[PDB]
């Protein structure tokens, strides 16, 4: 999945008129997501991680 571009995205669109471009049919990497020590908080609700 090309989620890295969104991860390092320079700009984000508005909440009311964000451009709709569906991206699917892939398996994500989550390689860099394993290092969560740099994030101030980490919350999960409704299911244990």
């Amino acid at each position, epitope marked *: 999945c090309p989620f890295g571009e969104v991860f390092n995205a320079t700009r984000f669109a508005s909440v009311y008129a964000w451009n709709r471009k569906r991206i699917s049919n892939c398996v994500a990497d989550y*390689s*860099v997501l*394993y*290092n*969560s*020590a*740099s*994030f*101030s*908080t*980490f*919350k*999960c609700y409704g299911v*244990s*991680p």
Partner: antibody
């Protein structure tokens, strides 16, 4: 079934060169990482460092960066931690243990027994 | 940054049901092993409970450790209180690599 014993030398003069090992086996060590935790007396648990599997990005604490250098080899499933210029504040039991689950560190189940080190 | 919420003042008569409340965050309370640390002034600190499965001789059976997910809270009741054991309870938690001290808890037993 689950027996892990730590062994090493006794009285070691500070500044000497010696290598230690805490071999982890019996499972898939390829996907399992080795973590080291130091427990300061009176205070809570202290984070030390973390290493990514890819190795592109490595993060270290400000109090351990520069002086220490770690080396690991997935082929032999053994981690080597060369201790140079031992500090007085580092005189504590060293826990050789693997993190909870797969790629999880925020959770802790079993503490480290500790290794016999003298500073 | 981190916000700690505790009651301003609360007390209950002995012999009734008491429940000390300390909110847990920065993760799942069912995934955190809550281990209490005490440092009695005038004495040298020594570990009393570690590894969550080792019992030194003389450890009382009254203390029990578990997590209750029915009401998202933990219940602990301590009997056999001793006069020299009267002190202040402080609940401490750590997130990443930051340490935050509490505002100060004062409790008086009437």
């Amino acid at each position: 079934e689950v027996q892990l014993v730590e062994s090493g030398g006794g009285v070691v003069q500070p500044g000497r060169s010696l290598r230690l090992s805490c071999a982890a086996s019996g499972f898939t060590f390829s996907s399992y990482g080795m973590h080291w935790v130091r427990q300061a007396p009176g205070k809570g648990l202290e984070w030390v460092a973390v290493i990514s599997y890819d190795g592109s990005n490595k993060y270290y604490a400000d109090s351990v960066k520069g002086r220490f250098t770690i080396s690991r080899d997935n082929s032999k499933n053994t981690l080597y931690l060369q201790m140079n210029s031992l500090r007085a504040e580092d005189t504590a039991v060293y826990y050789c243990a693997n993190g909870f689950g797969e790629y999880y560190y925020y959770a802790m189940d079993v503490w480290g027994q500790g290794t016999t080190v003298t500073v | 940054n981190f916000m700690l919420t505790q009651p301003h003042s609360v007390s209950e008569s002995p012999g009734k049901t008491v429940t000390i409340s300390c909110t847990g965050s920065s993760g799942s309370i069912a995934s955190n092993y809550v281990q209490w640390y005490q440092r009695r002034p005038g004495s040298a600190p020594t570990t009393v409970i570690y590894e969550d499965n080792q019992r030194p001789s003389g450890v009382p059976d009254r203390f029990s450790a578990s997590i209750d997910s029915s009401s998202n809270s933990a219940s602990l009741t301590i009997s056999g209180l001793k006069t020299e054991d009267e002190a202040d309870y402080y609940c401490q938690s750590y997130d990443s690599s930051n340490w935050v001290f509490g505002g100060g808890t004062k409790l008086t037993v009437l």
